[PDB]
């Protein structure tokens, strides 16, 4: 027919596809509006017609029925079919159903081949991630059972008032001179709880020695509701699964850490690291490795298919001077300094214009515009000239990128950014489509709920900071979820709207968006990347007993440092013991240094770096001793543990690897500093002096209304009473150094809440912040996070991994983070890993795979039975569960004994047999003990039965074997990390003790004692809540802290030191990043690939 020919001709024509794409984009723009005006209703038909028209065409050319090369045969045409039928259903007859219209956005993926291919590759990646997903579910369930057993109902502890019975009249309580109907109704009343200081949270409390303490007049009691609206708790197994999924993603995990330790006890912190350093880091890095290998296979398949005048120095110096001159800007500039800045900028732009004109005269426009850099310079100079005749100046900053001409690593960053929207732009487009789809889905589903039930989730009188009422805020929430903060807003979402639907939407966006982001990250990363005396001295130094003695002295001296608590002044004998011990260590180490000098001579001793370190430490000790016979030099004694680096080979080899990587690390650090200089200068221009708040101290610590107080001038003018304080946010953009600090907090994603809240309220220059005017400053931070964090971390990781690959290649292909003995044990483990394979009625029955499958089903059923445990369960439920446990123990005993009925070969045939034997023996031990927190441990011992699942699983077994193979390298890395934690905790004890308790620093997670400092350092090893700890350090003087305070040891107030605090926290954050992220990822990926 001719109709078929016409339909085919219109179908194949590119104009038709372009029309479909344009209408899809227009519909996407219309779906952004939260409140569609009535007239747009008419426009709806247009789309419904167009979507019909095109569909009709596809129906005419192809065949509706099923057959080769037909309409419904193509999977994506199902999208057209569903969209058209849904549109007709919604419009023809009678709504939340309209949210399904968002699926029309996916038509974009249909109208471009590149997006189809990208989605296909993503689907194969998801398919390959199946084993890791199963392992993650299994580990999360196991740790969730462990946490449920350990902390069942712990989070419901609260410091309630100490009630008194009214002479047992009717079981009533007369607390605080008020009678309540019953004890149960009294306890559930939140008017008698105790709020945590400076927070709107009920103080969790415990009765264990380590757990938190109830202030005088209060007592710990379990009655109440779980914290943060009751969505965090270990009471039910499913709640524990949610909490440990939160832990695994390290999402606001410091809050759960602090709550659990406050309620149960500090010792339980152990549990947390066993879930973080082996449950969170390990699982995420395993996912990283699996995705990377899948992408590598995809790239290999694609590759196989494809197969078959000296003035430049002057200009660069001028650019460097100009960028530095722009960096000479800050808050409260003097008039003369501002004039000097203006004159300098004017002369710089003048000279740049003159150079551009001269070198465009030398080569005419045809020649001049022949270079990309030349057109870039022309655009920059034109923009600067237009601005000369406000962020309009920031364009000039981009000139610094010219330094990429001969800077290879800045060129690598430029290549990364180019590939982001170049070769790999299709995947970026897919990510953008996903983000838009999820933003509109969330807004359409939750806009009315957020609007009409705002008071539920709005602590302030106005609307909440994060919501889905408007499209921009929905996109902001989706972006925040992508950045990793997916639960803090989820609690509000579930509180204001449906729990089930919000759970589903947020979990889906988390999983899918993080998958896409990780695919983009890995794709970019792979795409872009006397004589007798001397003899005696040598003999005495050479004895191994001498080395052991020196090691013992090093460790014991470090321990002696570990006692410098605030409580020494109370402990007298220990103080004098420590003084004598310190003198002894100084003397013995000096004696050892002299012996080494004599035995080996000055040249050999001073030609060894570690000898230099030991000599420096001893020199500091001697300087301190002679000064005593400098107070700022005493605290440098906290570097004593560094003597342990040279002795133990594990830390020595790890330090060798890190030193080898130092040059590349420094190159990338310089590139990152130059790149972040642009964003810090822009932030200084946008937000210099606009971060101040005229707070009223008496009425809390919240910014005043902009109507009553408008700016600093009015804040000082209304000073009849000394209540108003014009204070600036701790971390801000008043300078470029403060710019780097705030940018670091935004990039690491800790403490960015306050920075963005202060930015998106910046009303003017030192003017009082309005609630949320100047809103679109949000974009600023978003942009930064796209470049300053995503691409910057990509460069970090790529360069460091490339450096480690070069180091491995140089070292004969062997490992980098292992010793000789560890290498031999690793070889033995590898050999053991791939070992080759080696009454009649029962022998024939048990050996059958059906028996193993039945045992597997039985153990799965037992796991399900343990999932049912819950706090405050009725006694009959307890009895039934105990009986079921006894039955399961009996069944396992029966199966093990019938297996034993075979010859003794099974007694040693495999290691899993002995594991089964020992777990059964423990099971009977626990059951017999039941006839007699020890009970909690006995119950927790039952989790060993679940591990029997490992036998059947293949992917689980391989991944766990990879972890076991990686264990020694991780042991070395963790040893070095623990040494660094020890040193930094001693520094904190020396400095940060006595600081005012605010934000992260509370009565339990202080820096006062070694225990508390170690807890804080452990939590901020993952960079979690380091802004919280840093905040109390920064504040100096009123109204925050009170200097001139009678402190125990150092009576110079309770204020922190901003300079040393910032240095301490930034250096520790960077060191911990390096080690735990880069090295741990390197080990995980290497041992997974080899495994
Ligand atoms: C081949 C061998 C290579 C490995 C050895 C090289 C690495 C060793 C490290 C050198 C960096 C140490 C620099 C010392 C900084 C101390 C400055 C200082 O004394 O001030 C103090 C600074 O304290 C701080 O918080 C800064 C924290 C800096 C930590 C440096 C220690 C890092 C230890 C880990 C080494 C690196 C990782 C392991 C080795 C790769 C404050 O006291 P105050 O000012 O006197 O207070 C006044 C009233 N109390
Ligand atoms: C996860 C991270 C990925 C890797 C990071 C890549 C490198 C990006 C780095 C950024 C370094 C951070 C620099 C922070 C500078 C802090 C400046 C600041 O706080 O404000 C200034 C005052 O405070 C001070 O910092 C003065 C003391 C100087 C501290 C020096 C900090 C050294 C930087 C840490 C080391 C950098 C990393 C290198 C590691 C080997 C001025 O502002 P103000 O409003 O006038 O207040 C006056 C009160 N004194
Ligand atoms: C990736 C792709 C597609 C994910 C969407 C899966 C289809 C969702 C259909 C089930 C569903 O969402 O219904 C929800 C029912 O809640 C459930 O039972 C969750 C069922 C999830 C089963 C597995 C979901 C797989 C997701 C993929 C919410 O509806 P509602 O409870 O009536 O809401 C009342 C208003 N407060
Ligand atoms: C108001 C009530 C407050 C009373 C204070 C109660 C404190 C009781 C608790 C102490 C728990 C600390 C146990 C941590 C053990 C792990 C650290 C450790 O043992 O390392 C060693 C340090 O061991 C210690 O910290 C023992 C000293 C305990 C600190 C508390 C002092 C006792 C105070 C209460 C009596 C040193 O290793 P290294 O030489 O640095 O080697 C580095 C690389 N290998
Ligand atoms: C705690 C972190 C250790 C992670 C668990 C290590 C599990 C090792 C594993 O099951 O891998 C398999 C090894 O299986 C075995 O023969 C050992 C059987 C013992 C299973 C129970 C292990 C309990 C783990 C806690 C004790 C740590 C053991 C460390 C061993 C050096 C790989 O064998 P494959 O699949 O035939 O080779 C391919
Ligand atoms: C009886 C009252 C208290 C209401 C009942 C609420 C529970 C039935 C809900 C509350 C929150 C829900 C949890 C919220 C979060 C998760 C995380 C989610 O994690 C994953 O999806 C992991 C995916 C992966 O491993 O990649 C699995 C469902 C789960 C446990 C949900 C299971 C059901 C829970 C516990
Ligand atoms: C009356 C009050 C407000 C005076 C306080 C002003 C200072 C806080 C300003 C004046 C000089 C400024 C500095 C001028 C020059 C630089 C160079 C600039 O150099 C870099 O580019 C470092 C990073 C790199 O090497 O790329 C970093 C910011 C800094 C230290 C500036 C930080 C803020 C400073 C110290
Ligand atoms: C009190 C009422 C209002 C709420 C009761 C909670 C239920 C509605 C919870 C119980 C288990 C929850 C489900 C548990 C797990 C998921 C997995 C989640 O999907 C993933 O986690 C992605 C997995 C992957 O693709 O790898 C989507 C939400 C969903 C279906 C949850 C939806 C909500 C459910 C059904
Ligand atoms: C700073 C002050 C002294 C410096 C040290 C001075 C001498 C050396 C010797 C140097 O050893 C050599 O590789 C050859 C030079 C030599 O040892 O004579 C290694 C760096 C190191 C430890 C330096 C590291 C940095 C230090 C501690
Ligand atoms: C208050 C008035 C002075 C302020 C000045 C004093 C110290 C200055 C800082 C000195 C050192 C740095 C380190 C610099 O970062 C690095 O040098 C990284 C390490 C490296 O160089 O590799 C960025 C500027 C900054 C924060 C400077 C910003 C401005 C500061 C805070
Ligand atoms: C109203 C009062 C009595 C509250 C009682 C609630 C409990 C009886 C609930 C809370 C947690 C629930 C469990 C949460 C999660 C699962 C996982 C679920 O896992 C599966 O085996 C199905 C998915 C799969 O493995 O393919 C089986 C049901 C079970 C044990 C649920 C059974 C019912 C439990 C124990
Ligand atoms: C009507 C009156 C008596 C109200 C009280 C009823 C309770 C005694 C019920 C409510 C929930 C029930 C539980 C719900 C779910 C399970 C899972 C079920 O799972 C299995 O373990 C199956 C395998 C097996 O046990 O053989 C075992 C019974 C048990 C614990 C039930 C035991 C009896 C419970 C505690
Ligand atoms: C108010 C008082 C009574 C509180 C006492 C609480 C302590 C019992 C807690 C707080 C600090 C905790 C420790 C902090 C740091 C570590 C390091 C961690 O790393 C290692 O030490 C492994 C290598 C080694 O064996 O040294 C092991 C757990 C441990 C000892 C923690 C165990 C429990 C501790 C000692
Ligand atoms: C990298 O993320 C993750 C890694 C591991 C487990 C979970 C993760 O969260 C998922 C997603 O990556 C969200 N990220 C965004 C950026 N990230 C910054 C960062 O790496 N901080 C950091 C530092 C400075 C030192 C040590 C360890 C870490 C994680 C924070 C979290
Ligand atoms: C000038 C000014 O605003 N002073 C306030 C006062 O109005 C307020 O009543 C008090 C706390 O209630 O804090 C202060
Ligand atoms: C912050 C915290 O958890 N507890 C403290 C408590 O130790 C202190 O005695 C009291 C005095 O204001 O303030 C609160
Ligand atoms: C407060 O409660 C505690 C709980 O044991 C009790 O010992 C005490 O007598 C009560 N009264 C106070 C602290 O004044
Ligand atoms: C006070 O602040 C709120 C939000 O910060 C704002 O909506 C209101 O207009 C301000 N003025 C008042 C309450 O008089
Ligand atoms: O400066 C005068 C006083 O008030 C202000 C504080 O920063 C301190 O300097 C002192 O307590
Ligand atoms: O907070 C520090 C304190 O120092 C000074 C006091 O007069 C208070 O007004 C102030 O709050």
Residue numbers in the entry: 119 to 212, 217 to 430, 718 to 798, 806 to 945, 1193 to 1292, 1301 to 1509, 1520 to 1613, 1622 to 1780
What did the publication describing this PDB structure actually write?
pmcVoltage-gated sodium (NaV) channels generate the upstroke of the cardiac action potential by activating rapidly in response to depolarization and conducting Na+ inward across the membrane. NaV1.5 is the predominant NaV channel in the heart. Voltage-gated sodium channels in eukaryotes consist of tissue-specific high-molecular-weight pore-forming α-subunits of ~2,000 amino acid residues that contain four homologous domains (DI–DIV). Each domain of the α-subunit is composed of six transmembrane helices organized in two functional modules: S1–S4 form the voltage-sensing module (VS), whereas S5, S6 and the P loop between them form the pore module (PM).
The class ID antiarrhythmic drug (AAD) ranolazine blocks the cardiac voltage-gated sodium channel NaV1.5 and is used to treat cardiac arrhythmias and angina pectoris. A total of 2,154,834 particles were analyzed to yield 165,532 particles used to perform 3D reconstruction of the structure of the ranolazine/NaV1.5 complex at a resolution of 3.2 Å. Ranolazine blocks rNaV1.5c by binding in the central cavity of the PM, physically occluding it and blocking ion permeation. The ranolazine molecule is positioned asymmetrically in the central cavity of rNaV1.5c through formation of close contacts with the S6 segments of DI and DIV and more distant contacts with DIII. Ranolazine is located directly on the intracellular side of the ion selectivity filter, ideally positioned to occlude the ion permeation pathway with its positive charge, while its hydrophobic regions interact with the nearby S6 segments of the PM. Ranolazine also makes contacts with residues on DI-S6 by approaching Q372 on the intracellular side of DI pore helix and making a T-shaped π–π interaction between the aromatic ring of its atypical methoxyphenoxyl group and F403. In addition to these distinct interactions with amino acid side chains in the AAD receptor site, our structure reveals a bend in the DIV-S6 helix resulting from the adoption of a π conformation for residues 1,765–1,769. Comparison of our results with previous structures of NaV1.5 reveals a key role for residues V1765 and V1766, which have changed positions with the adoption of the π-helix conformation, placing them in close van der Waals contact with the underside of the dimethylbenzyl ring of ranolazine’s lidocaine moiety. Our structure shows that the π conformation of DIV-S6 in NaV1.5 can be induced and/or stabilized locally by drug binding. The π conformation of DIV-S6 induced in NaV1.5 by ranolazine binding suggests this transition may be an important part of the gating cycle for voltage-gated sodium channel, which may be captured by ranolazine binding that traps the IFM motif in its receptor site, as suggested in recent molecular modeling studies.
